[PDB]
Amino acid sequence: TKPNILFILCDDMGYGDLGCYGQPFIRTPHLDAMASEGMRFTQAYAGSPVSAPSRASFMTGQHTGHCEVRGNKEYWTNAPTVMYGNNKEYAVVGQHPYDPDHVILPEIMKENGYTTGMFGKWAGGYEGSCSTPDKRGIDEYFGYICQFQAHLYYPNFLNRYSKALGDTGVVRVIMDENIKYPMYGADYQKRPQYSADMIHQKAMEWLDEQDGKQPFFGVLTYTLPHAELVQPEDSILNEYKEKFNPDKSYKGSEGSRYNAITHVHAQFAGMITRLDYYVGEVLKKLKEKGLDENTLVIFSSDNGPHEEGGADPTFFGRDGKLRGLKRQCYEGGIRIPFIARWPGRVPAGTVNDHICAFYDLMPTFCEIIGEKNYVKKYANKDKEVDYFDGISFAPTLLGKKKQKEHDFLYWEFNETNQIGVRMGDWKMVVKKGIPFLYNLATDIHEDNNVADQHPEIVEKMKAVIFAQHTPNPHFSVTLPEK
Ligand SMILES: O=S(=O)(O)O[C@@H]1[C@@H](O)[C@H](O)O[C@H](CO)[C@@H]1O
Numbered sequence: 484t485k486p487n488i489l490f491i492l493c494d495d496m497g498y499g500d501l502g503c504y505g506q507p508f509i510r511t512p513h514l515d516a517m518a519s520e521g522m523r524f525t526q527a528y529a530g531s532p533v534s535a536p537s538r539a540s541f542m543t544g545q546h547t548g549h550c551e552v553r554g555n556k557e558y559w560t561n562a563p564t565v566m567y568g569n570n571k572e573y574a575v576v577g578q579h580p581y582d583p584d585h586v587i588l589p590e591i592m593k594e595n596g597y598t599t600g601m602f603g604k605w606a607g608g609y610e611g612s613c614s615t616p617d618k619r620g621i622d623e624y625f626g627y628i629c630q631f632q633a634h635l636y637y638p639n640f641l642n643r644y645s646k647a648l649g650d651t652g653v654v655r656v657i658m659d660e661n662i663k664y665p666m667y668g669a670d671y672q673k674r675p676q677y678s679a680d681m682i683h684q685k686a687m688e689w690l691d692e693q694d695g696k697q698p699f700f701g702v703l704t705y706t707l708p709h710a711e712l713v714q715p716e717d718s719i720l721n722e723y724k725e726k727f728n729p730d731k732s733y734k735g736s737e738g739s740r741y742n743a744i745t746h747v748h749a750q751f752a753g754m755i756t757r758l759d760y761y762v763g764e765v766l767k768k769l770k771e772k773g774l775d776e777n778t779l780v781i782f783s784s785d786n787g788p789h790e791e792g793g794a795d796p797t798f799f800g801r802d803g804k805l806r807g808l809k810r811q812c813y814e815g816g817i818r819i820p821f822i823a824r825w826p827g828r829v830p831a832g833t834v835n836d837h838i839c840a841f842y843d844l845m846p847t848f849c850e851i852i853g854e855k856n857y858v859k860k861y862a863n864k865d866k867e868v869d870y871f872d873g874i875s876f877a878p879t880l881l882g883k884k885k886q887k888e889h890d891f892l893y894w895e896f897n898e899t900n901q902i903g904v905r906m907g908d909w910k911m912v913v914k915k916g917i918p919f920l921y922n923l924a925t926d927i928h929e930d931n932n933v934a935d936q937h938p939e940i941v942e943k944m945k946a947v948i949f950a951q952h953t954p955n956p957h958f959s960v961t962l963p964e965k
């Protein structure tokens with residue numbers, strides 16, 4: 484009968500920003516109940532310390548030493564204008580496209596008889612590119628094609644692809660009341676069409692059309708709690724304007740599409756309690772429709788905590804254990820919350836220390852849906868080598884037999900010019916070609932560089948960097964000396 488699978492992947496949430504992982508100032512009751520009926524992962528990693536490559540890793544089953552997308556690259560900077568009211572907007576939006584000759588996860592599900600849904604941020608390819616959801620195995624899409632467009636929670640348009648409405652490809656749905664008002668300044672909050680509510684409703688309409696004939700695969704890529712720090716001025720926000728006193732404000736960034744706002748500690752806390760509430764409505768709806776015993780639901784985040792649009796990770800991180808933010812190959816930039824729930828399949832109230840990353844999700848779903856020897860089926864014969872880097876963690880997720888272990892995890896990132904490797908207790912961060920070494924068992928906060936005492940380990944972990952990194956012309960890093 485094949486099981487349904489939902490993956491809820493949010494935007495710029497830290498390892499320590501949820502209650503069940505140890506946040507002290509924000510309520511997350513729906514996700515904490517999910518973990519209490521679920522399995523909570525303690526050593527789970529993003530594909531990258533930043534959005535586009537992390538999402539590419541998940542989609543491709545490849546690490547950033549091999550992947551086509553290894554960073555954020557914009558294709559809208561020199562696009563022509565289009566006017567929505569008095570608002571000058573970009574006529575083509577989005578980021579670098581996925582390689583059309585390497586398979587992604589939505590296309591494997593389609594081959595296996597699933598119907599496919601995706602609600603929120605795409606960030607896999609610009610409008611008109613070789614990689615938009617219509618061409619890469621998505622039946623029903625609604626949200627933001629472009630990472631930069633997602634900066635505004637009250638935008639001029641959102642993107643749609645709907646077989647059901649007989650769209651021939653991606654269109655723009657114009658937000659008719661928003662366009663009457665500026666994009667920046669005092670009058671911006673006169674915009675009434677809030678993106679995260681409108682995108683959550685479309686996801687919920689899709690789900691209510693589902694029944695126990697065809698299996699369904701859903702990607703809920705909601706933008707909370709990414710900047711800007713603007714939302715509805717309702718009860719959720721007011722609870723936190725109460726708890727936090729005094730509070731700070733944000734001056735704004737017109738060039739970054741982050742609007743000025745007051746009570747920034749209140750804004751950020753409200754945005755996480757709002758996302759928790761959405762996840763409450765998903766889990767209830769699955770029970771309401773008799774879907775709960777045959778649906779796997781996973782919650783995670785695309786990278787480490789942020790400091791954009793008035794965010795204050797220092798205040799919210801008071802009791803946290805990990806070093807660093809988004810963009811850093813330090814543990815705080817890559818390690819993320821990961822919760823799984825499947826009544827009577829995934830054991831309830833469990834913690835799981837298995838060392839795993841987003842590039843492991845492709846083989847994990849393949850093993851769950853019955854699709855055997857996926858590499859030989861989907862690998863491209865016209866390539867000199869078609870890399871697949873993942874190991875399935877389906878065994879440990881069902882607490883059964885034969886869990887296999889990585890020799891290493893690997894990450895590289897251009898903006899901070901860093902490389903990260905984890906090999907058991909040992910962790911390497913290369914900065915501008917110089918290796919730093921830490922033991923995570925004696926030093927989780929990565930305070931003591933012990934490269935001096937451990938040269939045999941340093942060379943081994945360089946031997947991994949040399950074997951795993953391939954040329955990519957679009958994104959570059961400095962390798963250490965041989
Ligand atoms: O989470 S990320 O998408 O990496 O956030 C980044 C954001 O920090 C940066 O300012 O602009 C890019 C645009 O591609 C993304 O929106």
Ligand SMILES: [Ca+2]
Nearest residue numbers: 494495534785
């Ligand atoms: Ca992100």
